[PDB]
Structure formats: structure tokens, C-alpha cells
Amino acid sequence: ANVVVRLLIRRPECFGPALRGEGGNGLLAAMEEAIKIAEDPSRDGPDTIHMGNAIMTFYAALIDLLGRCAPEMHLIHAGKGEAIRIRSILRSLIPLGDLVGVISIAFQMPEPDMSAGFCPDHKAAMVLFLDRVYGIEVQDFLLHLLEVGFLPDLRAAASLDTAALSX
């Protein structure tokens, strides 16, 4: 994990251009535009590679890699200094509000439609990154996150009778 962070910071171009660069802001606008690419067929092969879905999977994989690259479950992080250093590096490199906005998108719940778009597994990487990098000991933070990015998805999951489309 440590050498992975060292190499990724030595070559910053490994990160997506919308995150890393003097250009794009971050994951929020990146995934807004990704949803736009998935919706608009002018940006694909006229089974084709959905460019928006590809961007979404790349960013989700990067977030999951960073989250699993987070120092620890705070076993050694309590007494270590290098672990705190790596965790601070991860925090300062990925804004928290960006992650909150990414989680709070509230994808639709569908007759079937296509899963080559904003898949529910994309937010799993964000949840893992939050759990392993930032964590939850703050009451109003937990309540705000639940109110904004968790309740709509919970309601969408619960409002199911027969049309079992996405497990």
C-alpha cells in the first residue's frame, strides 16, 4: 500500500484528468458528465463500449484501490506515524464533499432497462473509501450522510414487489 501511494504521487497522471490536473475539478462533475455520456449516444460507437460507463468504472476502481490502500482499520494507525501520514495524504488528495456528492446521486429504479450505466456497485467503492479513510464517529455527520445519500437508495431498494431486476 505504501509503495503504491508513493508511486501514484510520483506519477500524478495515473489519476483521471478530471480529478488530477489543472483542468477538471473532481469526481462530482466527472460523474455528472459521465452520466451525460451514458445518456447521450453521440459519444459512443454508432455491445459497444459505453464511454460513460467506462469512465465510471475507472473512477470507481481508482476509489476502491485507494480505499483498500488506506493504512489500516486503525489497529496500527493509532500508534504509527507513517500510517497517519498516508491517511492524511489520502484525505488531502480526495475531498470528502466530493465523495458525499458522488454517493448522493440516487440512481433510478426500473419492463427491464440496461445496466450499462450508473451501476449500484459504483457507490460501493465510495462507501469503502469513506469507511477506511474518513470513518464515522460524528453524530451530525452520520445523520447528514444518511439523510442525503442513503435514504433515497434505501427507499428504492425497499419499494420492490415483483420486478426483481437488480440484486
Binding site: 500524478p12 488530477r20 473532481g26 506515524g81 501520514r85 492524511s88 495524504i89 488531502s92 488528495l93
Partner: protein, 400 residues
């Protein structure tokens, strides 16, 4: 071949190639009033001089990263590649460190670099690495080597970020050249002898006067005038001068006869300048020409030698005393010499006793310039006075 041994004054420069032109920019820190660092242009020094006083750093400790972490979890050395150094600013006395806030919006991940008083923490330490394959870790660093510094805390590179007006150095992930120019090697600085970059003043053998300017009761146009004054002015803030040498390397060496350097008024920040239509006055840094503002000291009255010394790379020879060293000011362009006048007519002779300075060929054979260094305490007091009057005047104008 000279090694960088600890307890020496150094200057951290870098080379920037922007807009298809090359510039040499130094690392500077004001110290009092603000914490963040900025840039001083040693290049283009022919009309705008660089403030070498606030660009000087001293290396306190040179330990391994590992010995550093042992000390954290708890003697003239030689610098080795791969160690971690502690850069204390020469003037302010604080320490260079990696900050936690960011001002340049162009870098959302980089950190700023500034000064802090406390040595506790990994922010104030900078590990040192070579910039060439011929030099590896564990090697001694010579003068002029291509060095690069990484923050121990954030593991971020001492990057020279670029902006339209945001010319900062930040803690980024892209490397940038950093060269170390020696100033004072930390060797035996001969006590009682003049050293480059000092803040001192001049006195007379049988007059007890100093070359000063009018006090703050008048406007700065009136303060631009230069004269001699005695009495309580012997120990004041406006009676101090700084010898700013043109060279950026070994500027804090022993100053010798005939070499050129500017005289800076610490209280006002202006330099002594001459146009032939008038006498010498004080003017700001935006037009400080080398030929207009360069001077020297001679040990006699003749013109036997002018262009005899060109450059000496090192501490130099310890020649000029302070007490028993009768120096004579000589301009590099006109070769005119100091003279005291009697402008105050007999009608006002009993009042304010000021005898103006006119720089002339002949002079009087009674000058006897005896040098006297001002202590670090009042030199710092004078320069912080200059900084605070500048800031307060800016605030006053902005609010008015």
C-alpha cells in the same frame, strides 16, 4: 570541491524557463508580518537589486530520516545525501516548514511552505536528494550541486509553481532544481573585521557624527536628503547602513578594498544614488542601477588602483578593521569623495547642527571614517521598523 558543513549561511536558488526566457529566482521569507515564503529575483539585478538579507538560511541539524524519527518519537557536521536538514531563516530566526493551508487555487493538492517558530514536528525538516545519476545517497555534497528537497511530513516536492501573479513555491509532486550558494561558511569569522552583508555605521575621529537622513517629522522627500548628525543620533534606527554586495555567492565574505557594493538605508529601504546634475540622494529598488548605486572604500587618497580585483571565490582575506580602519568612500562612476559642508549659515548656526555631504574630488584631510557594527538586536529592530511602517502606510492609504 568545498563541502557544505553545518552552521553556515546559504541561499536557495532555482532556474525558471518561462515565456521563452530564463530567470534565476531565490527563496525568500519576510518573517515578521507574514509566514508564507515568496520569490526574490537575483537575476535582473542591474536595475532591481535582490533582497539577499531575507534570502539567507542556516542549516542547524543534518540527521538521517531515521534518527529524526527516533528523536520525534522520543558540532560542525558534514552534509550527506539522503539526510534531513533544518533550515533556520537567518533574519527572522524561525524555521522553514511545510504548511497545511493552500493559497494557489491552481493546485488543489499542493501545500504551501512558510516559517514556524517551533522545531517540534516533521514539517520543519526537509530531506535532501541529488538531482543527477553520478551522485548517490551517502555522498558528501559540494558547492553548486543540483539538490532537491522533499518535505518529511507530507512527502511533497519543493516545487516552483507558476502563476500570472501567483509566483509561489509549494509542496507539490513535481521536482524542481534547487541550488545552494554559500554566503558564510561558518568558519572562523574574524571578530572585529568587516564582513559582507553587515549592518553598521560610520563615525569620525574628532567629530562624533554619523551619515544619516532627516527624521520622520518631515516628508520622505525631505528624508531623501543625506547629511551628518551628532548627539543622540549616534545610536538610532535611521543611522544604520547595510553593505549589499552585487555577488549572490559568498556575499557574506570579508569585504576588501575596491570591490563594488550598494549602501542601503535599513530604515527606509532605499539606496544611495547619484545623478551628476545633483548630489547623492536615496531612491527605491525599482531603478537601482549598478553604476549609479555602486561604491567602494579606499585606504588612501590617490587613484593608484581601481580595476585590480575582479573576483575571489571563498571567505577571502580578513583585512578591514572596524575601529582603526580609516576608509574613504569612492563612487564607481565619478570617483568623487565625501566632503562635509557648512550649509547652515551663521544665522542658524546655534540651532540644528547638520553638515551636508557633497561628494567631490578634493575633500578634506580630516574625515577619518571609523566603522562600527550595529548589533543583531537593533539591526532586526530597524528592519522590522521598516517593514511595519511600509505595511501601516499601505493600510492607511487603502483605508483613506
Amino acid at each position: 570541491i568545498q563541502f557544505l558543513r553545518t552552521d553556515d549561511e546559504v541561499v536557495l536558488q532555482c532556474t525558471a524557463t518561462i515565456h521563452k526566457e530564463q530567470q534565476k529566482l531565490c527563496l525568500a521569507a519576510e518573517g515578521f508580518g507574514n509566514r508564507l515564503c515568496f520569490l526574490e529575483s537575483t537575476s535582473n539585478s542591474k536595475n532591481v537589486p535582490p533582497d539577499l538579507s531575507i534570502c539567507t538560511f542556516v542549516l542547524e541539524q543534518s540527521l538521517s530520516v531515521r534518527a529524526l524519527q527516533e528523536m520525534l518519537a522520543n558540532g560542525h557536521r558534514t552534509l550527506l545525501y539522503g539526510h534531513a536538514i533544518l533550515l533556520r531563516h537567518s533574519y527572522s530566526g524561525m524555521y522553514l516548514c511545510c504548511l497545511s493551508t493552500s493559497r494557489s487555487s491552481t493546485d488543489k493538492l499542493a501545500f504551501d511552505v512558510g516559517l514556524q517558530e517551533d522545531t517540534t514536528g516533521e514539517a520543519c525538516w526537509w530531506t535532501i536528494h541529488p538531482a543527477s545519476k553520478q551522485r548517490s545517497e551517502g555522498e558528501k555534497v559540494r558547492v553548486g550541486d543540483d539538490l532537491i528537497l522533499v518535505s518529511v511530513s507530507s512527502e511533497r516536492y519543493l516545487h516552483l509553481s507558476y502563476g500570472n501573479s501567483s509566483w509561489h513555491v509549494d509542496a507539490a509532486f513535481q521536482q524542481t532544481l534547487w541550488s545552494v550558494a554559500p554566503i558564510s561558511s561558518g568558519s572562523e569569522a574574524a571578530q572585529g573585521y568587516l564582513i559582507g552583508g553587515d549592518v553598521l555605521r560610520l563615525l569620525h575621529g574628532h567629530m562624533d557624527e554619523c551619515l544619516t537622513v532627516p527624521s520622520g517629522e518631515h516628508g520622505e522627500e525631505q528624508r531623501r536628503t543625506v547629511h551628518y548628525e551628532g548627539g543622540a543620533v549616534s545610536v538610532h534606527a535611521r543611522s544604520l547602513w547595510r553593505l549589499e554586495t552585487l555577488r549572490v555567492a559568498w556575499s557574506g565574505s570579508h569585504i576588501r578594498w575596491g570591490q563594488p557594493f550598494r549602501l542601503r538605508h535599513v530604515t527606509t529601504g532605499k539606496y544611495l544614488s547619484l545623478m551628476e546634475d545633483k548630489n547623492l540622494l536615496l531612491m527605491d529598488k525599482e531603478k537601482a542601477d549598478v553604476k549609479s548605486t555602486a561604491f567602494a572604500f579606499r585606504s588612501s587618497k590617490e587613484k593608484l588602483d581601481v580595476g585590480v580585483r575582479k573576483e575571489v571565490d571563498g571567505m577571502g582575506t580578513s583585512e578591514i578593521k572596524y575601529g582603526d580602519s580609516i576608509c574613504y568612500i569612492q563612487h564607481v562612476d565619478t570617483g568623487l569623495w565625501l566632503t562635509y559642508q557648512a550649509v547652515d549659515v551663521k544665522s542658524a548656526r546655534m540651532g540644528s547642527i547638520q553638515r551636508k555631504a557633497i561628494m567631490h574630488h578634493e575633500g578634506h584631510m580630516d574625515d577619518g571614517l571609523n566603522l562600527s557594527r550595529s548589533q543583531h538586536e537593533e539591526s532586526r529592530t530597524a528592519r522590522v521598523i521598516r517593514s511595519t511602517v511600509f505595511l501601516f502606510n499601505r493600510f492607511i492609504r487603502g483605508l483613506d
